[PDB]
């Protein structure tokens, strides 16, 4: 049928947009291709954990996979599975694998909950056309509060076995003159203290994160989307994937939408039309829809910047072997609490998450997800033969990211007399994983493919709201930036356009 506003997807940009539209009295339909994660599964839990992956762990794969960094210990629990509408999608491109959430809440279902604002001077570097005082004075605070960001108790952190891994890396970095920072989170840290005391069901302390948290993590279905539904003006239809977008003869937008079951069988194809269309399908999904629409002629006025400017937030994974006297613990909370902040906006910049490992025995390994400043960008190019947007990114384009991560961790190895691990990512000696991404940024960059509020160039009442807006890098964990940017954008759009 027809509904005044449609939002595609239910991640960060989508959830902020639909809440504010509903509060403005605009009837709003969200279309999500994944599930509403609320049905107990065969173990009585909604989500599977990392030591017992099953079909819920994976979007249409026929075998489970180990979390990156942990194949040596967790391959033993991998199993063949039926392709199913599970929660984590590894999207393979030619020389890059991008990991994204699939379900009501998008990546908030599978991420580490880490909520960090970017460095103001870096924000000003990457988005010079955006007024940074309103961002820091109004929209970042608004996002932190609605997201339910909270802070770990420092005495509990210092004492608990569950964060020994973090303290070991803090000590080791400290000998190289590098400091750490506490990272705020949407995982309830009071709940986490109660897990460790045996008082409530464990989640972070029971090796859950990347296939969802059965407790503790305030994902978007609990914060923005719950509020959006509370407005009485928002509905969410799941297992509905938007395939094409066109501008209707009489105005507005029309969508073809496929409804599938959790086995991926096509149940129905529907046409849905609207006056205002908001894309929050993610860096990959929103960019694919628009490149497809441009190159198949359904949104012929889209510009040449649609598709461009993609980068993996400089993501590189690496690991260090600790001395035998520095064990990292068999019990590691699955929610990171500390990062190494060596980000000064120069090309040597690194902000590195001190990542837990789920093996559950002592391995002496310290794992890091480094965020780096690498100018290289890729482009999504539409392939009409398979009807897919392919990412034009090559592995050598991550050499600057690898070099910055290695120069930082080389300092730590030099100060401590330690070496890298070389065997965590595959048979060949490879200390740096350079062909994955958890933080895809770009494809519909703010001010290039769109105006400075995400209005798609060439079109009226057509908006992009999510990580595709960000120009490839934010120098920290990205979802607080995506949320705040979306707060700024939908407020303006409702005021001037709706
Ligand atoms: C393992 C991992 C850990 C991470 N840890 C952190 C962290 O701790 N902190 C942080 O800041 N960031 C983290 N990230 C990154 C963060 O999750 C993403 O940056 C964020 O979710 C991106 O939000 P978004 O709104 O752009 O899109 P997404 O959250 O990706 O949401 C897009 C939604 O649109 C749906 N969709 C896509 N295409 C269609 C279509 N055609 N029709 C219908 N629905 C559609 C998708 O199914 C999904 O639900 C993590 C990511 C991963 C994978």
Domains of the chain are: 1-147+210-314+377-393+435-497 (3.50.50.60), 148-205+315-376+398-434 (3.30.410.10)
Say how many Å lie between the CA of residue 100 and the centre of ligand 1: 5
Distances (CA, A) of 97 to 86, 100, 394: 17, 10, 11
- List the resolution, Å: 1.5
Q: Are 307 and 379 a contacting pair, CB within 8 Å?
A: yes
Residue 30 half-sphere exposure, CB side, CA atoms within 13 Å? 34
Q: Answer yes or no: 195 catalytic.
A: no
End-to-end alpha carbon distance in the chain? 20
As annotated, the binding site includes 12-13, 32, 107, 111-112, 114, 242, 467, 479
Asked whether the CA dihedral 485, 487, 489, 490 is positive or negative, the reply is positive
If you write DSSP's letter for every residue of 112-168 in order, what string do you get? --B--PPPHHHHHHH-TTS-HHHIIIIIHHHHHHHHT-B---HHHHHH-GGGHHHHH
- Residue count of the chain, please give it: 498
295 touches ligand 1 (CB under 6 Å):
no
CB-based contacts of 412: which residues, under 8 Å, 6+ apart?
172, 173, 175, 176, 178, 320, 418
Ligand 1 contact, 339 CB (< 6 A) = no
Report which protein residue has its CA nearest ligand 1's atom 4. Answer: 111
Burial grade of 156 (CB within 10 A; 0-12, 13-18, 19 or more): middle
What six digits make up the tokens of 371?
A: 């965020």
Contact (CB, 8 A) for 306 and 445:
no
b (16+ CB within 10 A) / e for 34-72? bbbbeeeeeeebbbbbbbebbbbbbbebeebebbbbbbb
Measured CA to CA, the distance from residue 268 to residue 280 in angstroms comes to 23
Q: How far does residue 426's CA lie from ligand 1's centre (Å)?
A: 26
Query: Ligand 1 pocket test: which of 285, 370, 443 has the largest number of ligand atoms within 8 Å of its C-beta?
Result: 285
Cα 467 to middle of ligand 1, angstroms: 8
Catalytic residue among 215, 240, 331, 439: 439
The answer for residues whose C-beta is within 8 angstroms of residue 220's C-beta and 6 or more apart is 10, 11, 12, 15, 104, 105, 106, 108, 109
CB-neighbour burial class of residue 292 (10 A; exposed 0-12, middle 13-18, buried 19+): buried
Catalytic site includes residue 439: yes
- Extract the annotated binding site for FAD: 12-13, 32, 107, 111-112, 114, 242, 467, 479
Ligand 1 pocket, residue 354 CB under 6 Å: no
Cα-to-chain-centroid distance, residue 406: 24
């Amino acid at each position: 049928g027809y509904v005044p506003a449609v939002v595609i997807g239910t991640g960060y940009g989508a959830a902020v947009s639909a809440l504010r539209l509903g509060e403005a009295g605009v009837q709003t339909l969200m279309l999500e291709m994944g599930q509403l994660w609320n049905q107990p599964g065969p173990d009585g839990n909604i989500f599977c954990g990392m030591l017992n992956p099953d079909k819920r762990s994976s979007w249409f794969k026929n075998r489970t996979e180990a979390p990156l960094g942990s194949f040596l210990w967790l391959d033993v629990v991998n199993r063949n599975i039926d392709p199913y509408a599970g929660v984590l999608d590894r999207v393979n491109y030619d020389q890059m694998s991008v990991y994204v959430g699939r379900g009501v809440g998008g990546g908030s279902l599978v991420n580490g909950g880490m909520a960090v604002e970017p460095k103001r001077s870096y924000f000003e570097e990457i988005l010079p056309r955006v007024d940074s005082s309103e961002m820091y004075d109004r929209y970042f605070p608004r996002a932190n509060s609605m997201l339910r960001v909270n802070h770990i108790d420092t005495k509990w952190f210092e004492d608990t076995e569950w964060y020994k891994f973090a303290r070991v890396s803090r000590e080791q970095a400290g000998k190289a003159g590098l400091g750490t920072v506490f990272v705020p989170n949407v995982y309830d840290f009071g709940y986490m203290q109660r897990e460790a005391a045996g008082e409530v069901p464990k989640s972070a302390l029971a090796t859950e994160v990347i296939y969802g948290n059965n407790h503790g993590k305030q994902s978007l279905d609990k914060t923005y989307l719950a509020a959006a539904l509370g407005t009485g003006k928002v509905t969410i239809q799941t297992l509905h994937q938007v395939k094409t977008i066109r501008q209707t003869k009489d105005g507005g937008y029309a969508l073809t939408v496929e409804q599938k079951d959790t086995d991926g069988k096509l149940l129905a194809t529907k046409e849905i039309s609207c006056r205002y269309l908001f894309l929050g399908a993610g860096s990959l999904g929103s960019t694919e829809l628009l490149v497809r629409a441009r190159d198949t002629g359904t949104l012929p006025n889209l510009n040449s910047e649609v598709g461009a400017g993609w980068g993996p937030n400089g993501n590189i994974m690496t690991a260090r072997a600790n001395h035998m006297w520095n064990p990292t613990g068999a019990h590691q909370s699955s929610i990171p609490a500390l990062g190494i902040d060596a980000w000064d906006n120069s090309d040597s910049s690194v902000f590195a998450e001190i990542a837990p490992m789920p093996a559950g025995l002592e391995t002496w390994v310290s794992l890091y997800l480094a965020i780096t400043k690498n100018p290289q960008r890729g482009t999504f190019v539409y392939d009409a033969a398979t009807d897919r947007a392919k990412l034009n990114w090559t592995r050598d384009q991550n050499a600057p990211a690898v070099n910055a991560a290695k120069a930082l961790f080389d300092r730590i190895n030099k100060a401590n007399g330690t070496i890298y691990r070389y065997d965590l990512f595959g048979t060949q000696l490879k200390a740096f994983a350079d062909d994955f991404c958890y933080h895809p940024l770009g494809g519909c960059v703010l001010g290039k493919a769109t105006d400075d509020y995400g209005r798609v160039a060439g079109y009226k009442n057509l908006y992009v709201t999510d990580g595709s807006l960000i120009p490839g890098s934010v120098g920290v964990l990205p979802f607080v930036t995506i949320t705040a940017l979306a707060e700024r954008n939908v407020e303006r759009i409702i005021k001037q356009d709706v």
